[PDB]
Amino acid sequence: GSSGSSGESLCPQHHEALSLFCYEDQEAVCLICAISHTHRAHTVVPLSGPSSG
């Protein structure tokens, strides 16, 4: 089909499993970004929920 493995995305720069999400920028980020100059002092929040796991 159109998609192959619909599991998780990957940063367009780090290509890492995107699980985090910045608040200010209002966009998705990765483990790296979180601890990067770009979103260093930014409010990053996890995109996980107590529902699934």
Binding residues vs Zn ion (CB under 5 A): 11, 14, 22, 24-25, 30, 32-33, 39, 42
16 vs 53, beta carbon nearer Zn ion: 16
Amino acid letter at 28? Answer: A
Alpha-carbon distance 1 to 10, whole Å?
Answer: 20
CA angle 25, 10, 6 (to 5 degrees): 120
Least Cβ distance, residue 37 to Zn ion (angstroms): 11
**Known binding-site residue numbers for Zn(2+):** 11, 14, 33, 39
**Known binding-site residue numbers:** 11, 14, 33, 39
